[model samples]
Target: KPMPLTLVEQILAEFQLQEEDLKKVMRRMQKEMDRGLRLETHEEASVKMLPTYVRSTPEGSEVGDFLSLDLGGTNFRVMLVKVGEWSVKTKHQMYSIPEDAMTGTAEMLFDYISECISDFLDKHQMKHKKLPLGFTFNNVVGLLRDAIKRRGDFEMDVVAMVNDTVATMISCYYEDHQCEVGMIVGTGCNACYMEEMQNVELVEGDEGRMCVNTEWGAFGDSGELDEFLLEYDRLVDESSANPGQQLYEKLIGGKYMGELVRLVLLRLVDENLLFHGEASEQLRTRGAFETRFVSQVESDTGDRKQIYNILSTLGLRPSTTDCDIVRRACESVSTRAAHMCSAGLAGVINRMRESRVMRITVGVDGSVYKLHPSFKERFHASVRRLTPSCEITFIESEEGSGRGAALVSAVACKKACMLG
Candidate 1:
């Protein structure tokens, strides 16, 4: 009320990043990556460059029939994939796991999943043959694999087990051979990239490439990203399940960004610049607004009708001015998320380029990167500007989870066939 619009711009200004800001960010990431890669310094390091044991990507001659088992929150899928010279084909079926299996004994869950795989195999009439299986999950894969093997219901061979991000990379690589990096910006966030074996001090080898999951979500946890943080971000961090942890992810992750934007809107309401200075009761609650709302409001930059629709659902009745303020605030927060994500990626891209004048492709799959209207373009622009001497192409992955797992299996079989 007193000096509303001017101060709104001030709040937005905190998100503004120039070349120098991104340069510093990429530089800091390099310093941290080096610290993380060395065995002696990795224990206390923020960026945990965890070795994934995925030796290499598809080399175009990977001809095989592979099986992919995808285990997600409450859904299980089985995909049969055929790999040819520069071509791939797949068929899959989804099975929704019931509540009991999801909550009951882990053994029970695996038993149920194995049953589904049996049914899927019978439908395809492809039994008796032991196919190299890539089991993709959010972890707990070792338990699932062993449990299935013990069942002895059907022949099962698990060749590769990787998290969702690594699978995203491999799936994209099935089409584009240049892709060596897999990045995700979903509720959980990270990048898995092909790292030189010699550079990985943790794993003993110097001849070939191995995938390293740059659990970059925790990159800023040790205070490197404090300068870019704001009050809303600090509040979001304090209330998160793990405070003082995953600070970088809290800034840019899909789970946290909405809460961040909500806090900013609350401030405006308290400041009397929005909702006629009256805050909705629901608006004060944690997670009242979701990340999708940010993208929705941003999509309607013309009249902010989408913002009004989203706010009403949150019990916020607003004027046109209120809608306008909300959209502006959304852009500020989302813009920052895009820039931070880009800078983090630029650091990794530049690192790859440091190894050579290499052209690389980033296989990115996430709700934010895919569903959000402006995020991809904004991130792309910032990344290209931040990274120099690197010709980069970003390949978006569709149905990323199962496809990548299948490719991992194909690549593994390809290697096994090479020697034996």
Candidate 2:
């Protein structure tokens, strides 16, 4: 039987979204991109166009053995990579960053990281020799060469420090040479792309071009979100660690999407639109609904047994009607996120001077882009609508951070030797 008319009406009324709503959001996002890129010419842009001194990607012919240290998200990883003309071999180990190290002094954190690296070296019997190392970290902490030197006794030389997104881009570039943008949409979101040397005003010399980290998560920090942001989005922002910051990321990033769905569901339950009159106590709690849950719900088909199981786990006995409502809710949120990301990419394409005849390849490395059921379809649809003339390709970047760091270390090492 079809869903009752009253229930469908109530659900749609509560969500308050229409076919035109997504289009309007996409238009607003495209304009925001214009504002963001314009702000890049100055120091005060909401999206910081930070420079990564890596002016060129590897030519695939550069050969070397280098160490790559990746400290991002919840884990710290160190790899010894051997880069040959046609192949690369790596031996790596991963360690979890303790809670104390995350919240403690810089010395404590670096010491722990250094110890991990030391152990890796000792086990591999490379502790006696100093090798060029590429360090990949999550945040900007100024120059890392001195910082690594200050940490306990390690004979490794820090050749380059890069954001994970940039490393992914470099790795992709090494493989296909056609890549220009590196993007991340996982735990957090950011993008880095090649920029013309003359266009970047933050740096002094105008001779050679380099990659600029977009830090695109902060796209709406300039208070321009007043018109497009929903009330649920505002609530998420007010409760976030950095209120009024990363406004754009809050709308689309995986970290906040589940919470956004939770908040909406809370409202639906309160309005008596879902689960009849039985309220889910677990649903009342914050962060009880995760992005993975949303993905599972959206991907569920054939009687939606998965949806029933998930809701049961959350302490709700949902009916068929309730499951339908929940699935629609997930689709709405995920689709919006996809459209937002597509708008950001459109902005990137608009800014580039590349000819429309040339294919543009974007290197994407993130669980959300890879695992989300409908993310790629919705994103590509929006991209086609926004820039009809462009041929865009998205390449999955695997082990980009570790491999790219080694490539960068080799390049930076060669540069340093020439200078010396």
Candidate 3:
């Protein structure tokens, strides 16, 4: 027998959001883009538009041997990149930073990184010669330039410093001159693009362009998100490490997408709609459900065997009705997230129109963008609805950060020599 009407209505009331809801979210996201761009140029806006001194992207003709260091979330990477006229090569090693070193003083962290650099050099038999280096740090550390100088002991000259997103943009632009924006959408979300110098108010009278880091992950302040937020979103935000911050990221980023589904499912279970009213204690626990679970559920097309396996592992005996509910919930949440991301990208594209660029290419990097089965399709569909006239394309950048860091070194070195 099919599920009772009352039971289905209850589930829909709690978890089923209509298409209009997603469209409303997209509209607000578009408004946020205007506010974000204004804030970038405004002195009093809460969002900081940090200016990266990178004035231009690589021309594909620059050639050099350089070192690139990437300090990402869980690991630090060192690469010896050889840039040729037509091709680039890299010899790289990744090191996972220990808990102690991550929480330690700046000196301790730099020392650990320096030790890894030394090991990489020794293992590769690269010795006793100074080369221009690029540092790509994900964190907001003040001493990246100083740390390499103080700890590397003059072994390498630090020529350029940039975040991974900026590096991705530079690397992509080298390969495709049309790539104007770079986005990172894995654990967290952020973007960067080249802004004309005249439009940037902070840097006056220079008339030189620079890349603007759109720390757009923090976009939902000043009550813009109140209309679109659900109770589950509020709960996640309240219990997060940094409450009242990264609100946009909490909604769409991979770190919180699974948890959002968990909260909604817990609600369903409490109402006796899931797993025959027996709430699994494991499911109630925080972070028991990961983002991968959501991906699996969304991608489950036939028989829902993966969904059943996931629930079984989580100590739930789910019926067919339960599987349907879970699938619907996952689709709703993931669809909202995809639409939000597309809306944000559309805003960036609209902003880029001021430059008179007709075609826009975005260099996207991150596990979620690459792994999620339906993310690209949903994102492209949503963008098409919002901006039917604009020509937009997304390019996956596998190692754009590491390679772009080397390119930055070459560009920076060239600029230094020209100034000299």
Candidate 4:
């Protein structure tokens, strides 16, 4: 091959998206965002976005390892809390509460919460134990009593189950109040932003803005990103259970980044470009190279010493050229992930910028964004490049999402009297 590299440059080129390319990514994301927000539009959309009902961030006075539920609003959500005196931490997920469930029996509602409790607990790897649950239920004991006996799969210690809004305002009063949007870039990619209550079609009101978690993983579930997708990505999806689902997440989440790189490295070996053209059996395996490895590879010193040792552990006799090529591949893959998120985020921010000059703070946390060699800088730079008018600051969460529930319950439990 010419200069021991032709396809390498070709494949690397495929990963790059220019300014024009990114602009459309921004706009198309904007398109689906609006469609996903409507009741009828949601019928034709994959990104079924919903409101968080949280009006603000932390007051620091609220703290506890609590199981929190929000049913006072549209999509019912749960927060698996891990907050403390010094800091707040969390893991929250949302499931849309159908209108039918509202007018129907408490069976569906409680069952839905039971289902949510189980799903989130399972998803969060919660062990056998009852956490304190603070939630809302006008019917309270009327209907919620069933799911406990019916499902029998879970239960939680009762704290004052109340409206989430009061807690949101309570926690946020301590801060500057500028950070209306909360963005989490951890295991799965997602964000929530301030939206007028009127903007929410699911549940309507004249109350100002509420935080809407755009469950953005599903953004590219449709073919909007087919052109940008690679065969390796397709392979990664196929190997996954929910194949082709959560396309944008597959592209950006740390959960799949290493697999993406592994597939490409395998392709390189088959092409006789890496590892002396002999692939390690492990390289042929899925997730053989962990995403952390991708981070470390990218973080390797200029000498290639760290990279060489990394590959050496992978059952391959890597040469100096091998380490160099490997590093290039990791860099290319990580950059692609960063750019995809930046495009969508910048795209999201542009909508907010419609009201003259706007400034916003984005809170982010995730191993990929925080630990990866250069992801935060690349993401920050990309967002700046795409949305040039906004003065956005990124305040990273000490960890990932899921804490405010505890924050609210603490407010109710300690204060007892509402407003007292």
Number of the top-ranking candidate, with TM-score as the measure: 1
Model 4 — TM-score against the truth? 0.71
lDDT of 2: 0.72
The candidate with the higher TM-score, 1 or 2, is 1
Q: How many backbone clashes does candidate 4 have?
A: 7
CA lDDT, every prediction?
0.81, 0.72, 0.72, 0.71
TM-score of each: 0.87, 0.79, 0.79, 0.71
Which model is ahead, 2 or 4, in terms of TM-score? 2
Runs in model 2 lying further than 4 Å from the true structure: 1-41, 57-65, 70-78, 82-128, 136-154, 354-356, 400-405, 408-420
Task: Please give the range of 10 consecutive residues that has the lowest summed lDDT in model 3.
Answer: 39-48
Candidate 1 lDDT tens digits, 258-345: 8988999988888877898888878998998899998898888576578889999999888887888888888888888889889889
Clashes of each: 0, 0, 0, 7
Off by over 4 Å in 3: 1-43, 57-65, 70-78, 82-128, 136-154, 158-161, 205-208, 400-405, 408-420
